[PDB]
Tab-separated table of C-alpha atoms in Angstrom:
chain	number	residue	atom	x	y	z
Y	2	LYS	CA	-107.876	230.768	132.923
Y	3	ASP	CA	-108.083	228.276	135.784
Y	4	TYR	CA	-107.639	225.383	133.443
Y	5	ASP	CA	-104.145	226.211	132.250
Y	6	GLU	CA	-102.491	224.470	135.183
Y	7	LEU	CA	-104.753	221.425	134.870
Y	8	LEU	CA	-104.483	221.324	131.095
Y	9	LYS	CA	-100.770	220.630	131.241
Y	10	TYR	CA	-101.317	217.269	132.994
Y	11	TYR	CA	-104.605	216.211	131.416
Y	12	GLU	CA	-106.585	216.390	128.222
Y	13	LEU	CA	-110.354	216.650	128.762
Y	14	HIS	CA	-113.033	214.270	127.485
Y	15	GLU	CA	-116.826	214.390	127.246
Y	16	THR	CA	-118.448	215.077	130.599
Y	17	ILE	CA	-119.765	212.125	132.679
Y	18	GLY	CA	-122.156	213.761	135.131
Y	19	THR	CA	-123.416	217.309	135.642
Y	20	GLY	CA	-124.648	216.252	139.057
Y	21	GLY	CA	-125.384	218.537	141.959
Y	22	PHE	CA	-122.200	219.564	143.699
Y	23	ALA	CA	-119.602	218.996	141.008
Y	24	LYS	CA	-119.219	218.668	137.270
Y	25	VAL	CA	-117.428	215.425	136.510
Y	26	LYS	CA	-115.370	215.090	133.328
Y	27	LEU	CA	-113.724	211.990	131.887
Y	28	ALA	CA	-110.049	212.749	131.056
Y	29	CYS	CA	-106.692	211.395	129.906
Y	30	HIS	CA	-103.582	211.770	132.093
Y	31	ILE	CA	-101.029	212.757	129.535
Y	32	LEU	CA	-97.851	211.224	130.965
Y	33	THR	CA	-99.315	207.740	131.388
Y	34	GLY	CA	-102.097	207.789	128.805
Y	35	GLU	CA	-104.483	206.442	131.493
Y	36	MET	CA	-108.164	207.470	131.857
Y	37	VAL	CA	-109.203	209.365	134.974
Y	38	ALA	CA	-112.337	211.074	136.257
Y	39	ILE	CA	-112.085	214.694	137.294
Y	40	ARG	CA	-114.409	216.388	139.746
Y	41	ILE	CA	-114.633	220.096	139.096
Y	42	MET	CA	-115.922	222.483	141.725
Y	43	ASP	CA	-116.442	226.247	141.781
Y	44	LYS	CA	-115.158	227.851	145.006
Y	45	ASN	CA	-117.350	230.894	144.526
Y	46	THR	CA	-120.399	228.702	143.870
Y	47	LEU	CA	-119.621	226.482	146.873
Y	48	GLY	CA	-118.924	229.465	149.126
Y	49	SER	CA	-119.845	228.430	152.670
Y	50	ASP	CA	-119.478	224.702	151.905
Y	51	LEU	CA	-115.835	225.174	150.913
Y	52	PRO	CA	-114.430	224.563	154.433
Y	53	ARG	CA	-116.279	221.241	154.583
Y	54	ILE	CA	-115.203	220.330	151.039
Y	55	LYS	CA	-111.641	220.712	152.243
Y	56	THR	CA	-112.120	218.455	155.259
Y	57	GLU	CA	-113.903	215.874	153.075
Y	58	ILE	CA	-110.869	215.889	150.830
Y	59	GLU	CA	-108.580	215.461	153.793
Y	60	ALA	CA	-110.673	212.463	154.722
Y	61	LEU	CA	-110.509	211.006	151.207
Y	62	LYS	CA	-106.703	211.346	151.323
Y	63	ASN	CA	-106.612	208.793	154.125
Y	64	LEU	CA	-108.559	206.094	152.333
Y	65	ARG	CA	-106.771	203.389	150.396
Y	66	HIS	CA	-108.999	200.360	149.872
Y	67	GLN	CA	-109.872	197.866	147.163
Y	68	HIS	CA	-113.518	199.001	147.058
Y	69	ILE	CA	-112.997	202.670	147.525
Y	70	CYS	CA	-112.565	204.823	144.433
Y	71	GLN	CA	-108.949	206.108	144.525
Y	72	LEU	CA	-107.954	209.791	144.746
Y	73	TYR	CA	-104.989	210.774	142.557
Y	74	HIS	CA	-104.529	214.494	142.455
Y	75	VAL	CA	-106.018	217.570	144.040
Y	76	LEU	CA	-105.368	220.889	142.304
Y	77	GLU	CA	-106.604	224.237	143.632
Y	78	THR	CA	-107.113	227.410	141.600
Y	79	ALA	CA	-108.374	230.899	142.451
Y	80	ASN	CA	-111.874	229.832	141.387
Y	81	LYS	CA	-111.784	226.063	140.993
Y	82	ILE	CA	-110.845	222.911	142.878
Y	83	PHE	CA	-110.106	219.822	140.782
Y	84	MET	CA	-110.303	216.333	142.194
Y	85	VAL	CA	-108.771	213.608	140.060
Y	86	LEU	CA	-110.032	210.134	140.789
Y	87	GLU	CA	-109.933	206.583	139.581
Y	88	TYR	CA	-112.141	206.162	136.513
Y	89	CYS	CA	-114.930	203.529	136.751
Y	90	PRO	CA	-116.309	202.423	133.377
Y	91	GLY	CA	-118.889	199.995	134.742
Y	92	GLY	CA	-120.762	203.097	135.834
Y	93	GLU	CA	-123.216	203.513	138.691
Y	94	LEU	CA	-124.852	200.561	140.445
Y	95	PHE	CA	-127.784	200.466	137.987
Y	96	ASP	CA	-125.579	201.265	134.977
Y	97	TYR	CA	-123.824	198.038	136.088
Y	98	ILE	CA	-127.110	196.181	136.784
Y	99	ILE	CA	-127.947	196.046	133.063
Y	100	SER	CA	-131.537	196.933	133.925
Y	101	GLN	CA	-132.329	193.379	134.986
Y	102	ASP	CA	-135.545	193.426	136.972
Y	103	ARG	CA	-133.801	192.067	140.094
Y	104	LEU	CA	-130.765	190.107	141.301
Y	105	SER	CA	-130.879	186.657	142.833
Y	106	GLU	CA	-129.856	186.120	146.425
Y	107	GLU	CA	-126.366	184.948	145.423
Y	108	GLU	CA	-126.044	187.718	142.815
Y	109	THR	CA	-126.736	190.323	145.505
Y	110	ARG	CA	-124.467	188.602	148.008
Y	111	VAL	CA	-121.540	189.082	145.614
Y	112	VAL	CA	-122.151	192.810	145.339
Y	113	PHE	CA	-123.302	193.273	148.930
Y	114	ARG	CA	-120.179	191.742	150.463
Y	115	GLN	CA	-118.189	194.386	148.549
Y	116	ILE	CA	-120.381	197.203	149.886
Y	117	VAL	CA	-119.924	195.848	153.417
Y	118	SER	CA	-116.123	195.671	152.873
Y	119	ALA	CA	-115.966	199.258	151.734
Y	120	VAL	CA	-118.120	200.686	154.467
Y	121	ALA	CA	-116.441	198.687	157.224
Y	122	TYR	CA	-113.075	200.053	156.124
Y	123	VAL	CA	-114.470	203.606	156.202
Y	124	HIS	CA	-115.739	203.091	159.726
Y	125	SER	CA	-112.414	201.574	160.755
Y	126	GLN	CA	-110.738	204.826	159.725
Y	127	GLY	CA	-113.031	206.705	162.057
Y	128	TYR	CA	-115.496	208.096	159.539
Y	129	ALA	CA	-119.029	207.383	158.492
Y	130	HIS	CA	-120.270	207.738	154.944
Y	131	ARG	CA	-123.844	208.929	155.670
Y	132	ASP	CA	-124.704	209.060	151.983
Y	133	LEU	CA	-124.780	205.486	150.723
Y	134	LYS	CA	-126.856	205.471	147.512
Y	135	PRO	CA	-126.531	203.857	144.033
Y	136	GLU	CA	-124.774	206.828	142.408
Y	137	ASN	CA	-122.002	206.517	145.026
Y	138	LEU	CA	-121.500	202.896	144.004
Y	139	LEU	CA	-119.453	202.523	140.829
Y	140	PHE	CA	-117.997	199.513	139.071
Y	141	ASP	CA	-114.580	199.215	137.487
Y	142	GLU	CA	-113.642	197.186	134.417
Y	143	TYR	CA	-113.387	194.100	136.615
Y	144	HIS	CA	-116.917	194.530	137.977
Y	145	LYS	CA	-115.573	195.278	141.406
Y	146	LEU	CA	-117.379	197.964	143.352
Y	147	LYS	CA	-115.619	201.275	143.968
Y	148	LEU	CA	-117.319	203.474	146.519
Y	149	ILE	CA	-117.278	207.226	146.180
Y	150	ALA	CA	-116.272	208.236	149.701
Y	151	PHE	CA	-116.694	211.928	149.138
Y	152	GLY	CA	-119.832	214.041	149.490
Y	153	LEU	CA	-121.713	217.082	150.755
Y	154	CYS	CA	-125.121	215.502	151.157
Y	155	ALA	CA	-124.880	214.549	154.802
Y	156	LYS	CA	-123.677	217.531	156.822
Y	157	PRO	CA	-123.066	218.264	160.490
Y	158	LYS	CA	-125.467	220.701	162.120
Y	159	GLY	CA	-126.031	222.387	165.447
Y	160	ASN	CA	-124.017	222.741	168.638
Y	161	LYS	CA	-124.515	219.055	169.242
Y	162	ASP	CA	-122.629	216.552	167.089
Y	163	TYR	CA	-125.646	215.870	164.867
Y	164	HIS	CA	-125.824	215.098	161.144
Y	165	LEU	CA	-128.480	215.988	158.596
Y	166	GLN	CA	-129.336	214.499	155.200
Y	167	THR	CA	-129.280	217.510	152.822
Y	168	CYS	CA	-129.917	215.842	149.458
Y	169	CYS	CA	-133.581	215.098	148.881
Y	170	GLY	CA	-132.507	212.601	146.198
Y	171	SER	CA	-130.829	210.613	148.970
Y	172	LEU	CA	-134.088	210.400	150.975
Y	173	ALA	CA	-135.153	206.834	150.154
Y	174	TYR	CA	-131.709	205.573	151.263
Y	175	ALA	CA	-131.392	207.826	154.313
Y	176	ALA	CA	-132.051	206.736	157.922
Y	177	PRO	CA	-135.063	208.418	159.644
Y	178	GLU	CA	-132.978	210.148	162.319
Y	179	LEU	CA	-130.491	211.350	159.663
Y	180	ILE	CA	-133.327	212.835	157.647
Y	181	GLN	CA	-134.564	214.456	160.896
Y	182	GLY	CA	-131.125	215.936	161.434
Y	183	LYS	CA	-130.961	214.182	164.762
Y	184	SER	CA	-128.234	211.725	163.773
Y	185	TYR	CA	-125.220	211.062	165.942
Y	186	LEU	CA	-123.526	207.678	165.655
Y	187	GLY	CA	-123.748	208.074	161.885
Y	188	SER	CA	-122.253	204.635	161.338
Y	189	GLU	CA	-125.660	203.297	162.358
Y	190	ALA	CA	-127.102	205.592	159.683
Y	191	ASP	CA	-124.900	203.653	157.239
Y	192	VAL	CA	-126.201	200.271	158.314
Y	193	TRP	CA	-129.687	201.546	157.514
Y	194	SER	CA	-128.670	202.683	154.035
Y	195	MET	CA	-127.113	199.314	153.247
Y	196	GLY	CA	-130.338	197.700	154.382
Y	197	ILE	CA	-132.166	199.753	151.766
Y	198	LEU	CA	-129.565	198.699	149.169
Y	199	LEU	CA	-129.854	195.076	150.188
Y	200	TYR	CA	-133.630	195.383	149.667
Y	201	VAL	CA	-133.419	196.966	146.226
Y	202	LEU	CA	-130.888	194.437	144.937
Y	203	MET	CA	-133.133	191.514	145.873
Y	204	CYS	CA	-136.508	193.048	144.935
Y	205	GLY	CA	-135.882	195.540	142.158
Y	206	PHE	CA	-137.715	198.332	143.935
Y	207	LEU	CA	-137.455	200.390	147.106
Y	208	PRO	CA	-138.912	199.333	150.474
Y	209	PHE	CA	-140.103	202.914	151.082
Y	210	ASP	CA	-141.179	204.716	147.909
Y	211	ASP	CA	-143.600	207.504	147.033
Y	212	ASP	CA	-144.062	210.218	144.414
Y	213	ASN	CA	-145.139	212.543	147.226
Y	214	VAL	CA	-142.231	213.653	149.383
Y	215	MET	CA	-144.031	213.972	152.709
Y	216	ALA	CA	-145.655	210.615	152.033
Y	217	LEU	CA	-142.232	209.058	151.414
Y	218	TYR	CA	-140.930	210.981	154.440
Y	219	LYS	CA	-143.599	209.370	156.672
Y	220	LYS	CA	-143.232	205.824	155.317
Y	221	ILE	CA	-139.579	205.835	156.348
Y	222	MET	CA	-140.281	207.246	159.834
Y	223	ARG	CA	-142.872	204.451	160.275
Y	224	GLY	CA	-140.587	201.704	158.985
Y	225	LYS	CA	-143.075	199.195	157.537
Y	226	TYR	CA	-142.447	197.663	154.088
Y	227	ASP	CA	-143.585	194.831	151.813
Y	228	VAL	CA	-141.749	191.527	151.819
Y	229	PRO	CA	-141.805	189.770	148.435
Y	230	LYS	CA	-142.651	186.097	148.146
Y	231	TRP	CA	-139.249	185.271	146.682
Y	232	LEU	CA	-137.130	186.462	149.603
Y	233	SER	CA	-135.638	183.665	151.666
Y	234	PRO	CA	-136.082	183.640	155.476
Y	235	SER	CA	-132.401	184.441	155.942
Y	236	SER	CA	-132.748	187.415	153.561
Y	237	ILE	CA	-135.864	188.617	155.358
Y	238	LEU	CA	-134.170	188.302	158.749
Y	239	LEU	CA	-131.074	190.242	157.748
Y	240	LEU	CA	-133.289	192.961	156.355
Y	241	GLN	CA	-135.121	193.263	159.677
Y	242	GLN	CA	-131.827	193.513	161.567
Y	243	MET	CA	-130.672	196.401	159.379
Y	244	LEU	CA	-133.961	198.163	158.725
Y	245	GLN	CA	-134.681	199.247	162.279
Y	246	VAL	CA	-136.125	202.725	162.817
Y	247	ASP	CA	-134.374	202.675	166.192
Y	248	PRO	CA	-130.679	203.221	165.368
Y	249	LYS	CA	-129.710	201.452	168.601
Y	250	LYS	CA	-131.567	198.353	167.379
Y	251	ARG	CA	-129.746	198.157	164.025
Y	252	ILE	CA	-127.211	195.341	163.542
Y	253	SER	CA	-123.635	196.322	164.443
Y	254	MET	CA	-120.875	196.279	161.812
Y	255	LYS	CA	-119.103	193.574	163.786
Y	256	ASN	CA	-122.130	191.305	163.628
Y	257	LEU	CA	-122.789	192.260	160.013
Y	258	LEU	CA	-119.268	191.255	158.960
Y	259	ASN	CA	-119.828	187.670	159.967
Y	260	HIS	CA	-123.575	187.404	159.606
Y	261	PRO	CA	-124.883	183.977	158.622
Y	262	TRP	CA	-126.537	185.426	155.497
Y	263	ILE	CA	-123.207	187.073	154.627
Y	264	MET	CA	-121.134	183.940	155.211
Y	265	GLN	CA	-123.673	181.651	153.561
Y	266	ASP	CA	-121.982	180.924	150.218
Y	267	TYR	CA	-118.462	181.912	151.269
Y	268	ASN	CA	-117.911	180.456	154.777
Y	269	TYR	CA	-115.671	183.400	155.635
Y	270	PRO	CA	-116.753	186.903	156.743
Y	271	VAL	CA	-116.380	190.031	154.654
Y	272	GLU	CA	-112.718	190.976	154.282
Y	273	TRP	CA	-112.867	194.675	154.874
Y	274	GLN	CA	-109.253	195.508	155.567
Y	275	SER	CA	-107.211	197.264	152.858
Y	276	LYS	CA	-105.619	194.585	150.654
Y	277	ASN	CA	-103.581	197.165	148.766
Y	278	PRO	CA	-102.191	199.414	151.500
Y	279	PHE	CA	-99.226	201.821	151.072
Y	280	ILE	CA	-96.361	199.944	152.709
Y	281	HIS	CA	-93.357	200.618	150.506
Y	282	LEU	CA	-92.799	202.412	147.244
Y	283	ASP	CA	-92.915	200.117	144.215
Y	284	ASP	CA	-89.405	200.106	142.796
Y	285	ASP	CA	-90.416	199.932	139.116
Y	286	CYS	CA	-92.664	202.943	139.476
Y	287	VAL	CA	-89.822	204.797	141.176
Y	288	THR	CA	-87.227	203.924	138.495
Y	289	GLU	CA	-89.647	205.074	135.800
Y	290	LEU	CA	-90.275	208.415	137.481
Y	291	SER	CA	-86.603	209.085	138.160
Y	292	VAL	CA	-85.899	208.377	134.483
Y	293	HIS	CA	-88.427	211.071	133.718
Y	294	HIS	CA	-87.307	213.362	136.561
Y	295	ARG	CA	-83.726	212.685	135.575
Y	296	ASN	CA	-82.722	212.073	139.184
Y	297	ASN	CA	-81.443	209.450	141.593
Y	298	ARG	CA	-83.543	206.860	143.408
Y	299	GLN	CA	-83.415	208.077	147.007
Y	300	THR	CA	-84.121	211.639	145.919
Y	301	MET	CA	-87.036	210.333	143.844
Y	302	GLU	CA	-88.437	208.274	146.730
Y	303	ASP	CA	-88.139	211.130	149.209
Y	304	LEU	CA	-90.058	213.242	146.748
Y	305	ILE	CA	-92.899	210.757	146.222
Y	306	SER	CA	-93.134	210.258	149.976
Y	307	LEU	CA	-94.114	213.892	150.526
Y	308	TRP	CA	-97.261	212.469	149.000
Y	309	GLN	CA	-98.977	215.786	148.320
Y	310	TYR	CA	-101.546	214.497	145.831
Y	311	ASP	CA	-99.833	216.678	143.281
Y	312	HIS	CA	-99.117	215.579	139.723
Y	313	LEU	CA	-96.324	213.382	141.068
Y	314	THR	CA	-98.645	211.428	143.319
Y	315	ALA	CA	-101.114	210.986	140.464
Y	316	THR	CA	-98.367	209.777	138.120
Y	317	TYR	CA	-97.061	207.349	140.758
Y	318	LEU	CA	-100.541	205.930	141.330
Y	319	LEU	CA	-101.411	205.612	137.649
Y	320	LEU	CA	-98.145	203.761	137.006
Y	321	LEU	CA	-99.000	201.596	139.972
Y	322	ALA	CA	-102.385	200.778	138.505
Y	323	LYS	CA	-100.708	200.034	135.198
Y	324	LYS	CA	-98.468	197.423	136.784
Y	325	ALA	CA	-101.593	195.953	138.345
Y	326	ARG	CA	-103.323	195.606	134.941
Y	327	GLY	CA	-100.124	193.795	133.862
Y	328	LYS	CA	-99.355	196.654	131.497
Y	329	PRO	CA	-95.882	198.145	130.952
Y	330	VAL	CA	-94.886	200.513	133.757
Y	331	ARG	CA	-93.902	203.288	131.365
Y	332	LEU	CA	-94.456	207.000	130.818
Y	333	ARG	CA	-95.482	208.766	127.609
Y	334	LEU	CA	-92.460	211.061	127.639
Y	335	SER	CA	-90.894	211.768	124.248
């Protein structure tokens, strides 16, 4: 059984999403009693995608940001790969919307600034997302966005350095050239997707939408959309600057960060740099672990620092999160 190794660190809970690429189960990390989400993949099912899944994980390991969903633990079995991630109760973007017909300009600005923060960080690390959509946008118990920075939807193709949108669900949020599989400079692809998001937040429907798939396909490639009466000029403008069929004509991140629409109620640009980066080990978390590991501090630190996203790394991070909730930094041992 592949689960035996996992089952000694976690007890399972009712599944959250069947989804395409991975089953996702809600779970309890035994040592800390904290909730986590676990992504379960089947290596035999994934087959040829497995190499890419591994590089996507390597990418995720290098992301530590206030609006990126945190990775805790990666466990590999003969047949399975388990990803353990921060759990986000608020649910997906529209689980968090509360089904309200649409958000006001200031209501969307609050959310949208967080999306910009997350994506800017990702780009700063030298990656593009290439699959920004509502189900990749979760909300934690504080109603802060946590982006899922991991996916198999957008994939590289060809001898050239091109990317292709693979998930037909993602279509309405995907840039034209990405859909065509002629996307290089994928970061521009991301600016397009946020434009779509921006539109939906303020309007309560998509700018390009059709039951027919070719029809929807064509509307996107053509780039024309309705502009509701209730959108402000500023809103409308920012939309135009993002929703450009020509990738080269889409607003740059740099100009997005400090856009007048973006700065309008805040008078400071999006703060996209990691506010919680890994500088030094938190002493309390270390003392707690060494109590449990029955060892000395330096030894304990050196061990955490290997930072293998093993059960140790997960335990460290969950204790860390506990301190941040203002909870006791304690383990469940005994």
